[PDB]
Design an enzyme around this catalytic site. Structure first.
Site, short mmCIF file in Angstrom:
data_model
loop_
_atom_site.label_atom_id
_atom_site.label_comp_id
_atom_site.label_asym_id
_atom_site.label_seq_id
_atom_site.Cartn_x
_atom_site.Cartn_y
_atom_site.Cartn_z
CG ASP A 228 -2.91 2.44 6.25
OD1 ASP A 228 -3.06 2.10 5.06
OD2 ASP A 228 -3.00 3.62 6.64
CG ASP B 36 -1.90 1.11 1.27
OD1 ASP B 36 -2.21 1.67 0.19
OD2 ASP B 36 -2.37 1.44 2.38
MG LIG Z 1 -3.08 3.18 3.16
#
Ligand SMILES: [Mg+2]
Ligand SMILES: [Cl-]
Length: 198
Positions: free
Chosen positions: A169, A8
Site C-alpha cells: 500500500d 506486504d
Molecule cells: Mg503496508
C-alpha cells in the site's frame, strides 16, 4: 509470466488503527505520543532491529517518565493492529496453488509476535501455512523502500524479480520495487485486492 507473490503485511493484510494506538498510549500516561511520530527514534530503530524489544520499552518508559509494565506497553503498541479478515487468509491459501507466496514487511518483533499469535492462527493454519518465507525489516536490519531490501529478498529466495508480483500500500515502496523489474500493485486502505486474480 508471474510465479512469485511478494505480499506486504501492514494495510494489505492487517487493518491498522493509528488513532486507537495513540489513544491507548495516552490512557497509560504517554500524553504526547502523537508528537513522537525521527531517524534516530526508537520506532525507526526497532523497525530495522537496531534495538531490542526490551530497549524499545525502556525507550517508551524514558520519554514517558513513569512506571509502566512491559505488558501494558505491548498492549498499547499492539492496539495499532486490528485484524486480518479471514477471507484474506483464504486468499493466501488459495494463492499458494499457483504461486510461491512470500511476505515482505517493515515491522518489529513486538508486532510480529502479536500477529503470529493473534491474526494468522485460523482453523488449523498458522503463519508458516501462508508463506514460503517471511521477510521482516527488523530481522534483515533493513527497511522498505531501500533498494537493497528487495535485492536481498530475491537473492535469498532464489527468485527472479521479473517473475515476481509485489503488493504493497506504500507508493514509494512499489516505485522502487519497479526499478528492479518487479511488477506491483498498490491497494488502497482497506481494499479487497482479490480482484487481481479473477
Ligand atoms: Mg503496508
Ligand atoms: Cl514488566
Amino acid at each position: 509470466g508471474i510465479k512469485n507473490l511478494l505480499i506486504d503485511l501492514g494495510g494489505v493484510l492487517i487493518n491498522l488503527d493509528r488513532e486507537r494506538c495513540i489513544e491507548n498510549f495516552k490512557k497509560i500516561g504517554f500524553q504526547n505520543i502523537e508528537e513522537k511520530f525521527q531517524l534516530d527514534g526508537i520506532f525507526l530503530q526497532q523497525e530495522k532491529g537496531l534495538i531490542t524489544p526490551a530497549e524499545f520499552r525502556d525507550g517508551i518508559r524514558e520519554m514517558m517518565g513513569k512506571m509502566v509494565s512491559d505488558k501494558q506497553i505491548d498492549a498499547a503498541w499492539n492496539s495499532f493492529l486490528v485484524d486480518i479478515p479471514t477471507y484474506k487468509l483464504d486468499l493466501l491459501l488459495k494463492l499458494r496453488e499457483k504461486y510461491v507466496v512470500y511476505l515482505l514487511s517493515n515491522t518489529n518483533d513486538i508486532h510480529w509476535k502479536w500477529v503470529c499469535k493473534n491474526a494468522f492462527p485460523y482453523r488449523t493454519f498458522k503463519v508458516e501455512d501462508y508463506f514460503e518465507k517471511t521477510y521482516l525489516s527488523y530481522e534483515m536490519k533493513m527497511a522498505k523502500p531501500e533498494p537493497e531490501i528487495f535485492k536481498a529478498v530475491t537473492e535469498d529466495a532464489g527468485i527472479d524479480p521479473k517473475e515476481t508480483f509485489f503488493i504493497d500500500d506504500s507508493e514509494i515502496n512499489c516505485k522502487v520495487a519497479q526499478e528492479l523489474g518487479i511488477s506491483t500493485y498498490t491497494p488502497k486502505a482497506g481494499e479487497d485486492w482479490s480482484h487481481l486474480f479473477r
